[PDB]
Design a protein around this motif. Structure first.
Motif, PDB file in Angstrom:
ATOM      1  N   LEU A  40       0.801  -1.167  -0.076  1.00 29.22           N
ATOM      2  CA  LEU A  40       0.180  -0.123  -0.183  1.00 29.22           C
ATOM      3  C   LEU A  40       0.886   1.179  -0.027  1.00 29.22           C
ATOM      4  CD1 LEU A  40      -2.820   1.063   0.127  1.00 29.22           C
ATOM      5  CD2 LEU A  40      -2.792   1.057   2.711  1.00 29.22           C
ATOM      6  N   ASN A  41       0.750   2.119  -1.110  1.00 33.72           N
ATOM      7  CA  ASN A  41       1.661   3.216  -1.302  1.00 33.72           C
ATOM      8  C   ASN A  41       0.898   4.082  -2.174  1.00 33.72           C
ATOM      9  OD1 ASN A  41       3.781   4.928  -1.791  1.00 33.72           O
ATOM     10  ND2 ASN A  41       5.078   3.439  -2.826  1.00 33.72           N
ATOM     11  N   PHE A  42       0.193   5.087  -1.422  1.00 30.38           N
ATOM     12  CA  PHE A  42      -0.680   6.058  -2.167  1.00 30.38           C
ATOM     13  C   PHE A  42       0.077   7.056  -3.256  1.00 30.38           C
ATOM     14  CE2 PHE A  42      -2.949   5.195   1.746  1.00 30.38           C
ATOM     15  CZ  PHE A  42      -3.939   4.558   0.907  1.00 30.38           C
ATOM     16  N   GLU A  43       1.587   7.271  -3.137  1.00 28.38           N
ATOM     17  CA  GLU A  43       2.321   8.170  -4.087  1.00 28.38           C
ATOM     18  C   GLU A  43       1.426   9.396  -4.142  1.00 28.38           C
ATOM     19  OE1 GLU A  43       3.774   6.398  -7.364  1.00 28.38           O
ATOM     20  OE2 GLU A  43       5.149   5.211  -6.289  1.00 28.38           O
ATOM     21  N   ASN A  44       0.984   9.931  -5.172  1.00 24.07           N
ATOM     22  CA  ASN A  44       0.258  11.062  -5.436  1.00 24.07           C
ATOM     23  C   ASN A  44      -1.207  11.117  -5.282  1.00 24.07           C
ATOM     24  OD1 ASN A  44       2.695  11.596  -7.986  1.00 24.07           O
ATOM     25  ND2 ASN A  44       2.666  12.569  -5.962  1.00 24.07           N
ATOM     26  N   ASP A  45      -1.944   9.812  -4.977  1.00 19.11           N
ATOM     27  CA  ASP A  45      -3.234   9.509  -5.026  1.00 19.11           C
ATOM     28  C   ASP A  45      -4.156  10.277  -3.864  1.00 19.11           C
ATOM     29  OD1 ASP A  45      -5.977   8.668  -5.287  1.00 19.11           O
ATOM     30  OD2 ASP A  45      -5.422   6.444  -5.765  1.00 19.11           O
ATOM     31  N   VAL A  46      -4.401  11.508  -3.788  1.00 15.36           N
ATOM     32  CA  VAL A  46      -4.844  12.016  -2.633  1.00 15.36           C
ATOM     33  C   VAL A  46      -6.345  11.599  -2.452  1.00 15.36           C
ATOM     34  CG1 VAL A  46      -3.551  14.197  -2.880  1.00 15.36           C
ATOM     35  CG2 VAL A  46      -5.747  14.144  -4.215  1.00 15.36           C
ATOM     36  N   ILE A  47      -6.938  11.022  -3.272  1.00 15.08           N
ATOM     37  CA  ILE A  47      -8.485  10.471  -3.009  1.00 15.08           C
ATOM     38  C   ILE A  47      -8.591   9.292  -2.043  1.00 15.08           C
ATOM     39  CG2 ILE A  47     -10.328   9.694  -3.810  1.00 15.08           C
ATOM     40  CD1 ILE A  47     -10.280  11.693  -6.307  1.00 15.08           C
ATOM     41  N   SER A  48      -7.464   8.328  -2.828  1.00 14.11           N
ATOM     42  CA  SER A  48      -7.418   6.948  -1.885  1.00 14.11           C
ATOM     43  C   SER A  48      -6.873   7.408  -0.603  1.00 14.11           C
ATOM     44  CB  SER A  48      -6.637   5.909  -2.579  1.00 14.11           C
ATOM     45  OG  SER A  48      -7.437   5.621  -3.720  1.00 14.11           O
ATOM     46  N   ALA A  49      -5.876   8.210  -0.461  1.00 11.08           N
ATOM     47  CA  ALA A  49      -5.081   8.277   0.727  1.00 11.08           C
ATOM     48  C   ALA A  49      -5.892   8.891   1.969  1.00 11.08           C
ATOM     49  CB  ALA A  49      -3.961   9.345   0.458  1.00 11.08           C
ATOM     50  N   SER A  50      -6.731   9.833   1.388  1.00  7.98           N
ATOM     51  CA  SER A  50      -7.699  10.477   2.631  1.00  7.98           C
ATOM     52  C   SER A  50      -8.606   9.497   2.980  1.00  7.98           C
ATOM     53  CB  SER A  50      -8.202  11.882   2.329  1.00  7.98           C
ATOM     54  OG  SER A  50      -8.982  11.607   0.890  1.00  7.98           O
ATOM     55  N   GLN A  51      -9.180   8.840   2.160  1.00  9.53           N
ATOM     56  CA  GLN A  51     -10.063   7.828   2.421  1.00  9.53           C
ATOM     57  C   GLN A  51      -9.531   6.757   3.394  1.00  9.53           C
ATOM     58  OE1 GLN A  51     -12.501   5.940  -0.818  1.00  9.53           O
ATOM     59  NE2 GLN A  51     -13.312   8.012  -1.500  1.00  9.53           N
ATOM     60  N   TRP A  52      -8.656   6.315   2.918  1.00 10.44           N
ATOM     61  CA  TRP A  52      -7.821   5.382   3.776  1.00 10.44           C
ATOM     62  C   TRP A  52      -7.481   6.072   5.444  1.00 10.44           C
ATOM     63  CZ3 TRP A  52      -3.531   5.031   7.036  1.00 10.44           C
ATOM     64  CH2 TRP A  52      -3.042   3.776   7.390  1.00 10.44           C
ATOM     65  N   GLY A  53      -7.027   7.221   5.276  1.00 13.88           N
ATOM     66  CA  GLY A  53      -6.872   7.938   6.588  1.00 13.88           C
ATOM     67  C   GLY A  53      -8.342   7.842   7.406  1.00 13.88           C
ATOM     68  N   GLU A  54      -9.417   8.324   6.767  1.00 15.24           N
ATOM     69  CA  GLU A  54     -10.552   8.421   7.342  1.00 15.24           C
ATOM     70  C   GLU A  54     -11.119   7.178   7.927  1.00 15.24           C
ATOM     71  OE1 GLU A  54     -12.567  11.066   8.348  1.00 15.24           O
ATOM     72  OE2 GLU A  54     -11.106  12.302   7.607  1.00 15.24           O
ATOM     73  N   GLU A  55     -11.303   6.126   6.988  1.00 18.35           N
ATOM     74  CA  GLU A  55     -11.658   4.920   7.369  1.00 18.35           C
ATOM     75  C   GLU A  55     -11.047   4.328   8.497  1.00 18.35           C
ATOM     76  OE1 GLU A  55     -12.814   2.282   3.299  1.00 18.35           O
ATOM     77  OE2 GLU A  55     -12.186   1.303   5.106  1.00 18.35           O
ATOM     78  N   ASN A  56      -9.872   4.414   8.554  1.00 16.50           N
ATOM     79  CA  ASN A  56      -8.901   3.712   9.548  1.00 16.50           C
ATOM     80  C   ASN A  56      -8.729   4.722  10.833  1.00 16.50           C
ATOM     81  OD1 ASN A  56      -7.801   1.035   8.627  1.00 16.50           O
ATOM     82  ND2 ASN A  56      -7.648   2.270   6.983  1.00 16.50           N
ATOM     83  N   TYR A  57      -9.019   6.059  10.868  1.00 16.88           N
ATOM     84  CA  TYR A  57      -8.704   6.712  12.100  1.00 16.88           C
ATOM     85  C   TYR A  57      -9.342   7.741  12.399  1.00 16.88           C
ATOM     86  CZ  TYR A  57      -4.132   4.413  12.576  1.00 16.88           C
ATOM     87  OH  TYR A  57      -3.108   3.517  12.787  1.00 16.88           O
TER      88      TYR A  57
END
Ligand code: NAI
Length: 419
Positions: A212-229
């Motif tokens: 799992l490595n979002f690089e530049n993918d801001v949409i997936s990254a913030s979703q992962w952050g929201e879901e998990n934290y």
């Protein structure tokens, strides 16, 4: 059906490899759009350039315009290879350099170039363990064990799993290559010595894995952050929320300075600093990182014993990069501070000239949190890591940041594992 008559591993059977590759290559090419066909042809001619560009692009600032036809090539090669996914595993082969394992010891014996040094390969065994080696750009490989000499010391025997995008391509229909999509990493599964044309090579068996490595993918990254934290944030105590927010709003300067060497501002006390550290650290133990993830940090030179004006910090000169690599490859660095990281690889305007880019494997189970769930939409996608961990330095890879705002300078991608 294209995998119905083949083994997982063609070994040395070039004729079976070619029969398999020719058929799927033809089907694949006819399924490509014109744009995809052009970009694949561009990869045959300019693969080095495309792969190097992909690194510049992922680590650039947000306003990076870049080179628009290479932007197109990155997109089109990736959608192209995704039309050619394996239906069963395929073992592939390529010779490899020391540098791609972060290894800086000669594997050749001093007395016989055909023979591998026992102590060196013993050290190699430890260095390749407990490491996921990120593969940047696209990777092209061969289908059978090479029958030819290499100047390189290592043979990689790499297992591609079912559903890997891996396309048959190339101009020699009798030695067709395999083009692997971006986004993967190498995980060693075995080590041995192989003799090819009378000469010994270090043979690394490995699996192709996807971290799992979002690089530049801001949409997936913030979703992962929201879901998990998001729940983590709601369950913080009042003090934990307060001192997390203090740190992120500018308190980091005094807090991390104190953790590093006990510095205390004139208008504060040790007990107030200890309190803030205790609340932040307690908060970061509440929800361990739920899966292995890559995070990033723009590092200042003090994190490696250097000052801004140190001559050794000028990576525009070759000898300084070699010196830095010699000092830190394979080392474990204790980290007394909290570690501010971000799940995005983008450069950050406040830190645009820092020359050291941490690319950190953050394991499942780490005491860290996606803390940007607390802020508003102007946030920096941050994962804050508890103090008192260590970095295992896995690789150091230079790239040239041409941008005026980045400092017109080589920068070092420091691949590391949190321990
Ligand atoms: N640096 C980054 O890539 C990111 C930082 N942020 C946020 O920006 C704000 C400031 O970040 P930083 O400047 O990086 O805070 P920081 O406290 O980590 O670093 C500030 C200065 O102290 C140095 N430093 C930090 N830890 C050190 C250590 N163990 N040993 C020696 N020197 C050390 C740093 O090089 C820097 O010059 C924070 O709110 C932080 O969460 C957000 C995204 C990622």
């Amino acid at each position: 059906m294209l995998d119905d008559n083949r083994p997982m591993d063609f070994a040395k059977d070039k004729n079976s490899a070619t029969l398999w590759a020719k058929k799927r290559k033809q089907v694949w090419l006819n399924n490509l759009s014109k744009a995809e066909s052009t970009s694949i042809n561009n990869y045959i001619k300019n693969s080095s350039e495309i792969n190097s560009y992909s690194i510049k692009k992922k680590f650039a600032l947000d306003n990076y315009e870049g080179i628009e036809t290479l932007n197109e090539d990155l997109k089109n090669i990736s959608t192209a290879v995704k039309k050619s996914m394996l239906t069963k595993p395929l073992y592939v082969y390529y010779y490899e350099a020391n540098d791609k394992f972060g290894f800086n010891q000669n594997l050749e014996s001093s007395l016989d170039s055909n023979i591998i040094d026992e102590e060196a390969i013993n050290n190699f065994a430890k260095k390749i363990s407990d490491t996921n080696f990120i593969q940047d750009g696209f990777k092209d490989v061969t289908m059978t064990e090479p029958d030819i000499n290499s100047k390189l010391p290592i043979l990689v025997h790499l297992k591609l799993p079912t559903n890997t995008p891996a396309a048959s391509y190339g101009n020699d229909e009798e030695n067709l290559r395999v083009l692997i999509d971006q986004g993967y990493s190498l995980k060693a599964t075995g080590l041995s010595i192989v003799t090819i044309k009378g000469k010994q090579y270090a043979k690394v068996d490995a699996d192709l894995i996807k971290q799992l490595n979002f690089e530049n993918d801001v949409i997936s990254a913030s979703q992962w952050g929201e879901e998990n934290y998001a729940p983590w944030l709601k369950e913080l105590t009042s003090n934990e929320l307060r001192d997390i927010n203090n740190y992120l709003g500018g308190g980091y300067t005094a807090i991390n300075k104190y953790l590093l060497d006990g510095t205390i501002g004139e208008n504060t006390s040790k007990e107030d600093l200890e309190e803030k550290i205790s609340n932040i650290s307690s908060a970061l133990k509440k929800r361990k990182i739920p899966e292995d993830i890559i995070t990033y940090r723009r590092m200042g030179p003090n994190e490696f014993g250097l000052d801004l004006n140190s001559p050794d910090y000028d990576f525009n000169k070759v000898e300084n990069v070699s010196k830095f690599k010699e000092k830190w490859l394979g080392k474990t660095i204790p980290v007394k501070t909290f570690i501010s990281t971000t799940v995005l690889s983008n450069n950050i305007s406040a830190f645009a000239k820092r020359k050291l880019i941490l690319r950190l494997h953050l394991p499942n189970g780490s005491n860290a949190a996606y803390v940007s769930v607390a802020e508003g939409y102007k946030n920096e996608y941050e994962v804050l890591i508890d103090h008192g961990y260590s970095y295992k330095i896995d690789n150091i890879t230079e790239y040239y940041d041409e941008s005026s705002l980045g400092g017109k300078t080589n920068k070092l991608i420091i691949d590391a594992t949190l321990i």
